[PDB]
Scaffold this motif. Sequence first.
Motif, PDB file in Angstrom:
ATOM      1  N   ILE B 150      37.846  41.109  21.404  1.00 40.09           N
ATOM      2  CA  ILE B 150      38.713  40.484  22.399  1.00 40.09           C
ATOM      3  C   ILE B 150      39.212  41.518  23.400  1.00 40.09           C
ATOM      4  CG2 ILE B 150      40.815  39.144  22.750  1.00 40.09           C
ATOM      5  CD1 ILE B 150      38.538  37.569  21.350  1.00 40.09           C
ATOM      6  N   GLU B 151      39.607  42.698  22.922  1.00 42.28           N
ATOM      7  CA  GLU B 151      40.065  43.746  23.828  1.00 42.28           C
ATOM      8  C   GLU B 151      38.928  44.241  24.710  1.00 42.28           C
ATOM      9  OE1 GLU B 151      42.529  46.793  22.054  1.00 42.28           O
ATOM     10  OE2 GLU B 151      42.934  45.516  20.316  1.00 42.28           O
ATOM     11  N   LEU B 152      37.755  44.481  24.119  1.00 45.15           N
ATOM     12  CA  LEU B 152      36.595  44.874  24.907  1.00 45.15           C
ATOM     13  C   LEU B 152      36.186  43.772  25.875  1.00 45.15           C
ATOM     14  CD1 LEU B 152      34.768  47.474  24.888  1.00 45.15           C
ATOM     15  CD2 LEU B 152      33.210  46.185  23.441  1.00 45.15           C
ATOM     16  N   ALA B 153      36.369  42.509  25.484  1.00 40.59           N
ATOM     17  CA  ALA B 153      36.128  41.403  26.403  1.00 40.59           C
ATOM     18  C   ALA B 153      37.206  41.337  27.476  1.00 40.59           C
ATOM     19  CB  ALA B 153      36.068  40.086  25.633  1.00 40.59           C
ATOM     20  N   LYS B 154      38.461  41.584  27.095  1.00 41.07           N
ATOM     21  CA  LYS B 154      39.551  41.558  28.062  1.00 41.07           C
ATOM     22  C   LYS B 154      39.402  42.676  29.088  1.00 41.07           C
ATOM     23  CE  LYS B 154      44.595  41.199  28.247  1.00 41.07           C
ATOM     24  NZ  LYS B 154      44.667  39.768  28.657  1.00 41.07           N
ATOM     25  N   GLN B 155      38.997  43.867  28.642  1.00 35.76           N
ATOM     26  CA  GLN B 155      38.826  44.983  29.565  1.00 35.76           C
ATOM     27  C   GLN B 155      37.612  44.788  30.462  1.00 35.76           C
ATOM     28  OE1 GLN B 155      40.843  47.361  30.174  1.00 35.76           O
ATOM     29  NE2 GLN B 155      42.248  47.409  28.424  1.00 35.76           N
ATOM     30  N   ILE B 156      36.555  44.154  29.949  1.00 29.94           N
ATOM     31  CA  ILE B 156      35.359  43.934  30.753  1.00 29.94           C
ATOM     32  C   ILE B 156      35.559  42.770  31.718  1.00 29.94           C
ATOM     33  CG2 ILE B 156      32.953  43.173  30.644  1.00 29.94           C
ATOM     34  CD1 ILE B 156      32.867  44.837  27.928  1.00 29.94           C
ATOM     35  N   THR B 157      36.334  41.757  31.326  1.00 32.31           N
ATOM     36  CA  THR B 157      36.575  40.625  32.217  1.00 32.31           C
ATOM     37  C   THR B 157      37.362  41.056  33.447  1.00 32.31           C
ATOM     38  OG1 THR B 157      36.535  39.078  30.358  1.00 32.31           O
ATOM     39  CG2 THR B 157      37.582  38.342  32.395  1.00 32.31           C
ATOM     40  N   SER B 158      38.308  41.980  33.278  1.00 31.66           N
ATOM     41  CA  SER B 158      39.068  42.480  34.417  1.00 31.66           C
ATOM     42  C   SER B 158      38.180  43.285  35.356  1.00 31.66           C
ATOM     43  CB  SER B 158      40.243  43.326  33.931  1.00 31.66           C
ATOM     44  OG  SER B 158      41.142  43.606  34.990  1.00 31.66           O
ATOM     45  N   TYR B 159      37.204  44.008  34.805  1.00 31.74           N
ATOM     46  CA  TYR B 159      36.288  44.776  35.639  1.00 31.74           C
ATOM     47  C   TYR B 159      35.410  43.858  36.479  1.00 31.74           C
ATOM     48  CZ  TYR B 159      32.342  47.757  36.908  1.00 31.74           C
ATOM     49  OH  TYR B 159      31.351  48.418  37.592  1.00 31.74           O
ATOM     50  N   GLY B 160      35.045  42.694  35.937  1.00 28.13           N
ATOM     51  CA  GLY B 160      34.232  41.753  36.683  1.00 28.13           C
ATOM     52  C   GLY B 160      35.007  40.974  37.720  1.00 28.13           C
ATOM     53  N   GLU B 161      36.299  40.742  37.481  1.00 28.92           N
ATOM     54  CA  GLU B 161      37.107  40.002  38.443  1.00 28.92           C
ATOM     55  C   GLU B 161      37.311  40.803  39.722  1.00 28.92           C
ATOM     56  OE1 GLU B 161      37.806  36.957  38.006  1.00 28.92           O
ATOM     57  OE2 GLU B 161      39.123  36.571  39.720  1.00 28.92           O
ATOM     58  N   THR B 162      37.524  42.113  39.597  1.00 29.84           N
ATOM     59  CA  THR B 162      37.729  42.973  40.754  1.00 29.84           C
ATOM     60  C   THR B 162      36.429  43.486  41.360  1.00 29.84           C
ATOM     61  OG1 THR B 162      37.880  45.038  39.491  1.00 29.84           O
ATOM     62  CG2 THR B 162      39.887  43.711  39.698  1.00 29.84           C
ATOM     63  N   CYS B 163      35.301  43.328  40.666  1.00 28.75           N
ATOM     64  CA  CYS B 163      34.005  43.760  41.173  1.00 28.75           C
ATOM     65  C   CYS B 163      33.386  42.658  42.031  1.00 28.75           C
ATOM     66  CB  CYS B 163      33.070  44.106  40.013  1.00 28.75           C
ATOM     67  SG  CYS B 163      31.419  44.632  40.521  1.00 28.75           S
ATOM     68  N   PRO B 164      33.303  42.800  43.354  1.00 24.36           N
ATOM     69  CA  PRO B 164      32.701  41.735  44.160  1.00 24.36           C
ATOM     70  C   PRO B 164      31.184  41.733  44.051  1.00 24.36           C
ATOM     71  CG  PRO B 164      33.252  43.541  45.582  1.00 24.36           C
ATOM     72  CD  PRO B 164      33.736  43.924  44.210  1.00 24.36           C
TER      73      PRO B 164
END
Lengths: 134, 262, 120, 291, 114, 123
Positions: B150-164
Amino acid sequence: VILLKEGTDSSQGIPQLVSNISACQVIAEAVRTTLGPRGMDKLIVDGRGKATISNDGATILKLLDVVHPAAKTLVDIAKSQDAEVGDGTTSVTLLAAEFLKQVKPYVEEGLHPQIIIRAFRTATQLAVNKIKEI
Amino acid sequence: KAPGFAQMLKEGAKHFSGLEEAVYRNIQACKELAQTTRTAYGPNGMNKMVINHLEKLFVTNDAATILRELEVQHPAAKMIVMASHMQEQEVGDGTNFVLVFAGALLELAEELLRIGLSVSEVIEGYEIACRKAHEILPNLLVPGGGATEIELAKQITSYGETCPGLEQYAIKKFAEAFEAIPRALAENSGVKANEVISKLYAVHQEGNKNVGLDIEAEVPAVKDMLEAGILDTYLGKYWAIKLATNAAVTVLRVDQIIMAKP
Amino acid sequence: VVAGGGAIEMELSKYLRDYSRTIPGKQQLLIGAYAKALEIIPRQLCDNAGFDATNILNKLRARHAQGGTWYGVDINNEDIADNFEAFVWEPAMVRINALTAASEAACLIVSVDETIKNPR
Amino acid sequence: LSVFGDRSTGETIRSQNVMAAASIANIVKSSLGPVGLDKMLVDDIGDVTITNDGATILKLLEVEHPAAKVLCELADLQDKEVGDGTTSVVIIAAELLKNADELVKQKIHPTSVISGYRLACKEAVRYINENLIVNTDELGRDCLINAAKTSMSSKIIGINANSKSVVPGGGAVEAALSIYLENYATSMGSREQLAIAEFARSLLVIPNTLAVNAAQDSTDLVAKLRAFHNEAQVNPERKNLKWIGLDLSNGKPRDNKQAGVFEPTIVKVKSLKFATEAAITILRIDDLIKL
Amino acid sequence: ASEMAVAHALTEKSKAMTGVEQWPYRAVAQALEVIPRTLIQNCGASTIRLLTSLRAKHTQENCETWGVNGETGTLVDMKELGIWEPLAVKLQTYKTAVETAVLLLRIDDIVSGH
Amino acid sequence: KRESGRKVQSGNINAAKTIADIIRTCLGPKSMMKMLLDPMGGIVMTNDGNAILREIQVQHPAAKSMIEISRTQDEEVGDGTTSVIILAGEMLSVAEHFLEQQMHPTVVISAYRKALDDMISTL
Ligand SMILES: Nc1ncnc2c1ncn2[C@@H]1O[C@H](COP(=O)(O)OP(=O)(O)O)[C@@H](O)[C@H]1O
Ligand SMILES: Nc1ncnc2c1ncn2[C@@H]1O[C@H](COP(=O)(O)OP(=O)(O)O)[C@@H](O)[C@H]1O
């Protein structure tokens, strides 16, 4: 052409458990009438036509050798009870199929199998404690 | 009588047309491989009444024994099985991590291909997320019980939200693939999996890392994996996330299975 | 030792059933289901002996509620009898191993969800 | 035999009437409670009357079956006598038939089942009457504010411009009777212990149905109700909670005396009486003659 | 623009929505994207490429503009193109879609009888 | 005869979704045309969302509700009617959370009603 099974028969989920519950009741019915001293006898015939009459539950299961996977579990469990004690195979065989029958409608209603295991492991220890106290 | 089969000219092999989604079919062969082992995941894993080739009865829940006895004939499934065999090298655990995680990557890839995203762009997102996961995993022995997932998913999801760009679609689904592992532990314990993900994300939103699924039939809550002593290996998750992504990417790169003859 | 003829099986059915009520959750219906499953032992002894299992089990389960602990099935006379006073005994440890092997056998079947068969 | 019609006998006639009444119940099972789901009513012309009220459904429900028409005639008796509880009647009567039909397969005659259900309704009305609360708590106490507050909380008003006797509802009666009648069955015997026990288990469908409609695990909440109610029977100590109901929103048991979830006494009394008389009327049917 | 502008508000507001309702709450936001999905499909331009960039504009730039041009297919500000629609039409269009979907979801048994 | 269980909600979704897929391309100034085969072999090449559904025969009652709600829109507002059916069909097309996740409709309806109050405020 390109399939995954290619002869590998497999089924999973609730239908597999319900199939094993019904197969276990067949082993119960084979030794249901032999419970007690006045229990009904059972006639068994081998390949040579030789007859075998006996009301002992342990002797009946040895001669059947049922090929169903779930049924072999009860037979090997009952056989071990015969080697260790020599009595109580019918009680173990009937109770096991009856524990499976009573939880059968709950399994169909979506109850998980693992929740059922916690009940048997819990109710068993409470029963074993009640025997020694009484 | 015409019109016969379209795109069928190589030994009459079953070539799925553009409507039949040939890529969608190789994924379904891998999803079925996960369901055979998704239930055996965790301490409450369900046993498998395996029948050996010698007509021997064995009841076990080990993944390597299930696949060794299950003759996997589909090549698309053999690649993930080869990753499980490669998982056995350099580590002796995390086999079902490869089956469950890769099955989620391919299962979630169908949601992208159905939208219209190219398979070559989906691969670039998973390769970017795998590289990003290896940077976050040191920051997390690591906690188990689905805590890192979940933490690795939470950290990766934030990277994808800010990555256009378009890579965010496959990067976000790479995070949801990690959620399949807590969902496996919850389903095998008799718990609504969606309630476990909702609670695991809330405690991680408050910064309570090292929180995993509390294995219990009558308690769907969560607990700290550190206090309970549940811990996983770093290299087990590192090589599992690496080999699982390569197996999923290797299957996505394939679009047509063709027969041959020497 | 304990009273045979299903007398101990009805006592556990009273204890587990009364205990299941105090257990909130999904274990309530299952521990109660575990209790009713113990009825088969005194039931088939009545059915195999040609007796009416209804009239005996209802008269037997009612006796355990009032204070009975050893009353059970009498294969000779079609009525309930104190199997302990009648010297119908069985070893407690042998009966303990029967419940354990029964639950352990049912747990192996319940814990199974899929069957796998190598094509041969 | 040669006749100008058709005849059909045996145990399957009981099963056919059981599955019919069970079907009519499922049409008004999910629509039970205030969070009940709406249901379409396709008339012969083509109009579609959408509603969730169980009484309005049964008035318009048209199933050409005799056993179903008995429950429709039963609905008019409950509507005129009281005007509420018709949905629980058809659901309670359907479970008593599905459970009685299982007993008939165990060589239990319907007459022994009819006798057990009659005694269970008598004792149930006794236990209900012994555990009522008279119309009081008007001024100086709070047997109201919490009742009206919980009723208006659905709308935007919930923040804070442009009967002589009542009983705790929410499955509290059906859960309490599940333990009492199960213990009363062990005292009588005589081919009626199983019928009174199945009457006890049949009442749990109401809290089991209300829990499914509230999007919660019915197996757990029904078990939690019976535990708080069973502890009231073991001893009268105050540590054991009493008269615990079922809250549909929060998905947790709650004491209805504080929450103000009350119902009339005649509803739970008449609904158990009319539902029992209906299952008795259908269980006596062992044959069908058509002309 | 109003669809993508509203969808960004729900997606940002769903971050503080603890529970299982966050998943369908976000799915409604992705459903509003279908309106520009059809406007872009009709013009012939790439749907994924423009709809992806369209959502990025609402994140950074103001949400009151940067919609879609149905004729040309490219992005354009509504301040520069008079495609401004009334409020009462969109509110009633949004309520009737949710109220209708809530209706059919509340149906669980299609019954016959008069 | 009748329908019951999960088949109803998934069936109502496919009916409402199917009616929206007809007029998905009837939106905007570059709207696409539709070919309506009359019973006498004739054709009408209209591109109006109201006129298309008016002439189409529907068997599911869920489709009749979608169409009848669109007619009520035309009486009040002669514009945006095509957007109602498309959004109602897309909001219902997400059947993953509806059935595959085994969520109750009350959980979904509570979220859809919560978003509606937020969609109104944002507009
Ligand atoms: N007691 C436990 N509590 C919670 N999670 C556990 C527990 N034991 C194992 N797990 C989880 O199960 C997963 C699989 O563990 P293991 O069976 O050792 O590997 P594999 O399934 O690949 O054989 C691990 O990722 C771990 O997080
Ligand atoms: N020139 C345009 N550019 C972009 N979008 C447009 C244009 N004209 C109309 N639309 C969109 O088409 C949708 C439908 O408009 P309209 O045809 O007036 O209503 P209806 O389709 O219900 O008859 C509106 O929501 C609007 O956003």
